[PDB]
Design a protein around this nucleic acid. Structure first.
Lengths: 58, 294, 159, 169, 209
RNA sequence: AAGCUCGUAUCAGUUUUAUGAGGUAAAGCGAAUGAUUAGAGGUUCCGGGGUCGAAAUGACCUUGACCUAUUCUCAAACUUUAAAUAUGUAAGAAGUCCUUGUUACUUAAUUGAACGUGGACAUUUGAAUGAAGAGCUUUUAGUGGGCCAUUUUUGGUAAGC
RNA sequence: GAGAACAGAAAUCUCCAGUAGAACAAAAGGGUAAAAGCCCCCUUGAUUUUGAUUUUCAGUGUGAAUACAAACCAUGAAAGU
RNA sequence: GGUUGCGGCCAUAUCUACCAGAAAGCACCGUUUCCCGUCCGAUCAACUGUAGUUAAGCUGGUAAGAGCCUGACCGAGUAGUGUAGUGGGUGACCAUACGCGAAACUCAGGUGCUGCAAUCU
RNA sequence: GCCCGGAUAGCUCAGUCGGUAGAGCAGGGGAUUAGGAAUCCCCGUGUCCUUGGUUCGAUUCCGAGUCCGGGCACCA
């Protein structure tokens, strides 16, 4: 005994109630899936430069 | 010839790039030579474009750009006379010399000439310019043949040897030089040294100097004119190398009839095209002629 | 049965820019993409490697990573009632910069110049974008441009 | 007018089509080898068909390229057999031309029963210098019209030298 | 059986033509589309009468054939075979389906063909002389019974069957800008190469008479 | 339902501006593909059915297929072209610029890349409109048989299918 | 298309045209001409570690695929793949 | 301004036919000992720049040329289209209100622009 | 009426992936034999249903028309 199979009725409205909102950016984003090379280097660079701006405070 | 390409054919013809239409560039090769690791972001991939006319060699260091290719340095075979090579300027020795010239020229104008002194003790041995620890890296450059065929025994590789011996790190294998026994897989440095300093030519000169001298006269007439025998060639090319290693620069020519003079008289033979009134006038005249039931 | 493959419903989309088949020109490969750069996606059927899914055709995202032949792109995709952050890895043949920021930056430079001039002169800047206003009170004249009177024309058969 | 477009042969090519593989084809290969001095160069089938009793990729026939003055000498030999007499079809609009013949023995080569008797197709191609524009990789090109050997041109050439005799048309 | 024509009068489904996907269809009943003095120069028959649809619908090949036959019979009986060049300006290409022990797998098999007709769309047209007006109008008027819908009859202010209303046609024909191809004309343009423009129209820039 | 952090803060089923993508409607077939009517003339090269000395490896017929230029009509799975409505992205302080710090990565290289220091640029922080707030979390019921209208639209002759 | 003995609709060899009407194992579509097609040389990157991502999607898996990295290799003159 | 080389965009660059091309350059061209390769020094490879040549390639000009490109109150504000009506019409389907807006066609105009270096009366 | 299968000499029946028209009978003429059945031989004769494409060429490759021949839908 058959039965309706598919539709998208009302779903847009359901979403838009409390819906879509927004992808919610932030400053200082991730390093997911970035080149592990240059990850590996940027680490050493930050280590050195933090050492530098630290030693510059005596 | 009746093959009349119709409007539809012409309408759905896709033209190739201009350089392919001419027949001078393989863009296949060009992509795989120019594409740079994008994580270097502007590091130009310098290519040694080597071209062989029937009466001139063209060796140039080239980079690419959206606007057009850009030349860092260039070297031609008609310039070797300023180092002392007048005759035989499409041969293996002049190829070697042109490679040495462009090589020494680049590092001189770049400031590296103190280091990367190359071999300078030529014995025809395969060897690359190693990197100076506690110092800069050697200059990397990739040979662009173009449409020329890769075969073993070719004069492009004389130029390659010259560039490598001049101080550039030019990546290459030894399996397309002459004297490379293939079943052995081994190079013959003495033969290469001969092909650098004109041994096969000089041997041939002696060989025609006892086989047939009419031919030796007709081909080697410039040598005969300038009082040149076979065995002077090694010393000649050595002195040329020495002058090159001394001053490889690009002193240009002096250009009697300068730019505007050339434009003014050396090119005033072209017919400029008509104007719209002129086309209409020609058509009017043509109908005035063609008006007859013939 | 049904068909929901990767390149489904992609007849004309990755069909090719008529009378532009052929090996791709090299400005594509000479372009340079740094991190923080906005790029529009337009696939190429001639380059089957590095391809995007059809969903990302015509979208515009920001680069998060760069490799030998490809770049990594951040997109935001609408899924139901939320946006999800997607990371594509595309060869660069399918990619080109976005002229929108070029326009914004031109406006920025112009605003800076105008502000410096007004700061120099002690006068006003007013350098936001205002909309299209209607129109002031104009005056035409009938000198030579006399009114040509018109009327409808009747029905005639133009078959 | 005539500095460089004077005229010339490009080459000649001879074809011997057996219709099968084996002894006969290798024998014709020996014919060509001794006849040319070049070692010949065979042909294969294109697609199997039953009427000829052949199959695909079968070495059916042989041919060879001859060029240079040797080809011209051998051309003269063949023309001696052709009795300085040629017909009109026989002749490209592009000026190239050729004919066919029996009993290859008729010029030079004696009989060699072991080789066995065959005939052959002759066909020669005319050109002028600068033709290698079309063949060279760099700046591959195509000919003008104040050039471009054709039927009538090659006919006039062919009668001018060889003291030849064309026929019906 | 040929179920009625109200079942296929209107354009309800997309066009479904005979193709590599829909093969194994029958052949049209109407195969002749041009009749009368088909071999008539454009100068013989300046007049023309268009039969134009006012409704958007489909027309059966059967009805098209019937109307053609009836019209032709009226002409040939009254004025003769050589007093008109009738042209049928619509082709039946749209295939009609029938379902013909459940509504399961009801995709139908080809029943016939029909031409899909818009408003202002020509259906029959005629290219006579001016002395057969009342006859060709009556022929088409008799044909109007063999079509569903509403089909009006318009007297076309053109020279016949090509284009160019009568004075415009006269300017070109007197000016010699016209060559008579078989049953149709070729015109002189001012774009092509001038040599061949003359070798097809020698007269235009030649003192003709 | 409980609320939590903040509070004018960043937003919005919207427009505008700039930039992108699309292949439907449409239009078109003397533009490709496929289909299709009519004639044109030309196909000396003969494929076919005739006449001409059974003669024809030769002319005259019709008769093809092809060639050239025209002509009538068409497409959900053909298309050059190519809308409307829809759709993505940007409209800055998380900015614009300078400066030169770092680094085993990259460079021929103090070149590059990333990330920072210090310094100038907020009255207008930099389209419109609104904002009876913005954001975030946990938890859990009920639902998980649907139906009608307008328009587009599939099958079916059709239907309160 | 023009030509050539056997040899013809069609065997094989020429020359001209030929934007792809060819082929790319297969269904259809896309794509492709100094190739992704045809010939020829060498190869085993159809390998190794463990991660990321895309499609389907619950943003779960499976399947498939993309891009990298540390490795080992091939090929090429090399860029490179 | 030419020419060459390397290129960009990749027909305003192509295609058919016909003209011209001073300077050099390119190319044709001269040969076959060596490398190498071909059935074949044709191609490819190598030597000379000598033996000869612009005839061809190549450049430019020419054609109411094809094609291509661009544009227009030419077509057409048409076709088509978002929204509205207790608007019309038996219905098909149509008009109307606010808005968007085509392609075909016609007509006009044009037929490669240009980066780096080298050389050129 | 839809699911399938056929159409050939006068009749009947054969078709190598297409090149051709096969077999018998009916039927003309002998042959035969002292005569005749018998038989051996040869005349023939056929759009291979209908038209349409189909290719070089199709009658054997397809599509449509026609005349037939084999099934079919259960349970209330």
């Amino acid at each position: 005994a058959k039965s309706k199979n598919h539709t998208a009725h009302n779903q847009t409205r359901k979403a838009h109630r409390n819906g879509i909102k927004k992808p919610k950016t932030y400053k200082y984003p991730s390093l997911k899936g970035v080149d592990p090379k240059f990850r590996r280097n940027h680490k050493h660079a930050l280590h050195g430069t933090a050492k530098a701006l630290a030693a510059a405070k005596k | 010839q009746k093959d009349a390409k119709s409007s539809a054919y012409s309408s759905r013809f896709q033209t190739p790039f201009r350089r392919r239409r001419e027949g001078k560039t393989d863009y296949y090769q060009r992509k795989r030579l120019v594409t740079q690791h994008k994580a270097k972001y502007n590091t130009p991939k310098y290519r040694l474009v080597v071209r062989f006319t029937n009466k001139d060699i063209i060796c140039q260091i080239i980079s690419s750009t959206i606007t057009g290719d850009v030349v860092l340095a260039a070297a031609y075979s008609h310039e070797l006379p300023r180092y002392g090579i007048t005759h035989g300027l499409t041969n293996w020795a002049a190829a070697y010399a042109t490679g040495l010239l462009i090589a020494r020229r680049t590092l001189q104008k770049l400031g590296l000439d103190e280091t990367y002194k190359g071999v300078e003790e030529v014995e025809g041995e395969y060897e690359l310019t190693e990197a100076v620890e506690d110092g800069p890296r050697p200059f990397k450059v990739f040979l662009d043949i173009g449409l020329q065929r890769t075969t073993t025994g070719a004069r492009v590789f004389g130029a390659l040897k010259g560039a490598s011996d001049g101080g550039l790190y030019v990546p290459h294998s030894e399996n397309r030089f002459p004297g490379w026994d293939f079943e052995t897989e081994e190079i013959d440095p003495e033969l290469l040294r001969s092909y650098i300093f004109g041994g096969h030519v000089s041997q041939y000169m002696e060989e025609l100097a006892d086989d047939d001298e009419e031919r030796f006269s007709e081909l080697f007439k410039g040598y005969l004119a300038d009082d040149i025998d076979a065995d002077s060639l090694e010393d000649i090319y050595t002195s040329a190398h020495e002058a090159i290693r001394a001053d490889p620069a690009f002193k240009p020519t002096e250009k009697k009839f300068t730019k505007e003079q050339y434009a003014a008289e050396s090119k005033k033979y072209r017919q400029t095209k008509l104007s719209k009134e002129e086309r209409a006038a020609r058509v009017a005249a043509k109908i005035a002629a063609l008006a007859g039931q013939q | 049965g049904k068909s929901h493959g990767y390149r489904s419903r992609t007849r004309y989309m990755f069909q090719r820019d008529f009378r532009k088949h052929g090996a791709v020109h090299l400005s594509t490969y000479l372009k340079v993409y740094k991190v923080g750069d906005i790029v529009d996606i337009k696939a190429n059927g001639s380059i089957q490697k590095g391809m995007p899914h059809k969903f990302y055709q015509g979208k515009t995202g920001v680069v998060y990573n760069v490799t030998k032949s490809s770049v990594g792109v951040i997109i935001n995709k609408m899924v139901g009632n939320r946006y999800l952050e997607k990371r594509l890895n595309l060869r660069v043949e399918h990619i080109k910069h976005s002229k929108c920021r070029q326009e914004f930056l031109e406006r920025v430079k112009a605003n800076a110049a105008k502000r410096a001039e007004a700061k120099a002169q002690g006068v006003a800047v007013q350098l936001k974008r205002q909309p299209a206003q209607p129109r002031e009170s104009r005056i035409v004249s009938t000198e030579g441009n006399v009114p040509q009177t018109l009327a409808p024309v009747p029905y005639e058969t133009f078959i | 007018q005539n500095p460089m477009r004077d005229l010339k042969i490009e080459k000649l090519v001879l074809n011997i089509s057996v219709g099968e593989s084996g002894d006969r084809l290798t024998r014709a290969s020996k014919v060509l080898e001794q006849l040319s001095g070049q070692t010949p160069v065979q042909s294969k089938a294109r697609y199997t068909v039953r009427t000829f009793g052949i199959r695909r990729n079968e070495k059916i026939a042989v041919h060879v390229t001859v060029r240079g003055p040797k080809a011209e000498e051998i051309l003269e030999r063949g023309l001696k057999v052709k009795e300085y007499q040629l017909r009109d079809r026989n002749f490209s609009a592009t000026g190239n031309f050729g004919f066919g013949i029996d009993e290859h023995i008729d010029l030079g080569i004696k009989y060699d029963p072991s080789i066995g008797i065959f005939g052959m197709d002759f066909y020669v191609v005319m050109n002028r210098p600068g033709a290698r524009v079309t063949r060279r990789k760099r700046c591959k090109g195509t000919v003008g019209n104040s050039h471009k050997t054709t039927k009538e041109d090659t006919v006039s050439w062919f009668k001018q030298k060889y003291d030849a005799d064309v026929l019906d048309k | 059986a040929r179920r009625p024509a109200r079942c296929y009068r209107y354009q309800k489904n997309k066009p479904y033509p005979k193709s590599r996907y829909n093969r194994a269809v029958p052949d049209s009943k109407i195969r002749i589309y041009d009749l009368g003095k088909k071999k008539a120069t454009v100068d013989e028959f300046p007049l023309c009468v268009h039969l134009v649809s006012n409704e958007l619908e489909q027309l059966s090949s059967e009805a098209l054939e019937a109307a053609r036959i009836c019209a032709n019979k009226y002409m040939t009986t009254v004025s003769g075979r050589d007093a008109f060049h009738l042209r049928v300006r619509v082709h039946p290409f749209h295939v009609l389906r029938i379902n013909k022990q459940g509504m399961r797998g009801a995709w139908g098999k080809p029943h016939g063909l029909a031409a899909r007709v818009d408003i202002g769309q020509i259906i029959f047209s005629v290219r006579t002389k001016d002395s057969n007006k009342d006859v060709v109008v009556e022929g088409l008027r008799r044909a109007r019974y063999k079509f569903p819908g509403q089909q009006k009859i318009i007297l076309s202010k053109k020279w016949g069957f090509t284009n160019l209303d009568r004075p415009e046609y006269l300017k070109k024909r007197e000016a010699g800008e016209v060559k008579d191809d078989g049953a149709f004309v070729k015109f002189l343009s001012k774009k092509g190469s001038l040599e061949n423009n003359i070798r097809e129209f020698p007269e235009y820039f030649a003192a003709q008479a």
